[PDB]
Amino acid sequence: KRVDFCGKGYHLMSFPQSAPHGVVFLHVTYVPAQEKNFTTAPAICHDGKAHFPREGVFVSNGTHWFVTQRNFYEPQIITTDNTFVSGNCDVVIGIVNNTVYDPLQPELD
Amino acid sequence: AGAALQIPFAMQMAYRFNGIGVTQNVLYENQKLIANQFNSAIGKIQDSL
């Protein structure tokens, strides 16, 4: 996890080869590509409660809000298993209104 | 690690709080105090210099 100790990018793995009086390291790394821009927010307010992502960031495609993982764009809908709650929505700078979906009660019809 | 991708600075500070074991609500609920403390700490360096 040391930055730039094993090449440029996120180190995946490395292979050694012998040279005359030396060694050659072939570093395999992961390099992110083809980014898009989005709107973002730190928390989400629902029922007077602030919701934070468990892992990921809240992003908006223009009209809807999703959670994604931070390094590869893979959007999902914001549920109570995606997030955790802390406090009320009066203290966070930049909080946004949206609905956080519960699975249990629409299972219970 | 590649191309520069923008992110707002308080959200970068929250990632970094996660990286030491503190949840990020602890940053967002203290943002103003944390920024005051950083500013006083930076203002103390030029005084010693």
Ligand SMILES: *[C@@H]1O[C@H](CO)[C@@H](O[C@@H]2O[C@H](CO)[C@@H](O)[C@H](O)[C@H]2NC(C)=O)[C@H](O)[C@H]1NC(C)=O
């Ligand atoms: C943002 O993504 C959503 C996808 O959830 C698009 O909204 C539509 O949402 C309904 C119900 O959620 C789906 O049945 C549709 O298939 C979605 N797409 C369309 C084209 O109707 C929404 O269009 C996206 N917004 C932008 C600006 O890209």
Ligand SMILES: *[C@@H]1O[C@H](CO)[C@@H](O[C@@H]2O[C@H](CO)[C@@H](O)[C@H](O)[C@H]2NC(C)=O)[C@H](O)[C@H]1NC(C)=O
């Ligand atoms: C990001 O910065 C913009 C300014 O560029 C902020 O927008 C202003 O919001 C205030 C309310 O606090 C309004 O009174 C101003 O009229 C807005 N200005 C513009 C140019 O839109 C925005 O609130 C900031 N975002 C956050 C999360 O603080």
Ligand SMILES: *[C@@H]1O[C@H](CO)[C@@H](O[C@@H]2O[C@H](CO)[C@@H](O)[C@H](O)[C@H]2NC(C)=O)[C@H](O)[C@H]1NC(C)=O
């Ligand atoms: C997000 O939703 C909340 C919930 O209603 C909004 O809070 C209201 O804000 C208006 C204007 O600031 C007040 O007149 C109401 O009294 C508030 N309602 C409650 C129940 O407190 C909040 O304004 C919404 N945020 C945005 C940006 O529209």
Ligand SMILES: *[C@@H]1O[C@H](CO)[C@@H](O[C@@H]2O[C@H](CO)[C@@H](O)[C@H](O)[C@H]2NC(C)=O)[C@H](O)[C@H]1NC(C)=O
């Ligand atoms: C955590 O520590 C900080 C000290 O940096 C406290 O904030 C200070 O509180 C004193 C009260 O004695 C104020 O006079 C200062 O102005 C505060 N500093 C800043 C930068 O706001 C804070 O109260 C402490 N929190 C708790 C829960 O004890």
Ligand SMILES: *[C@@H]1O[C@H](CO)[C@@H](O)[C@H](O)[C@H]1NC(C)=O
């Ligand atoms: C994102 O938008 C900015 C302008 O706000 C633009 O300069 C940048 O090239 C865009 N990047 C992508 C991936 O769309």
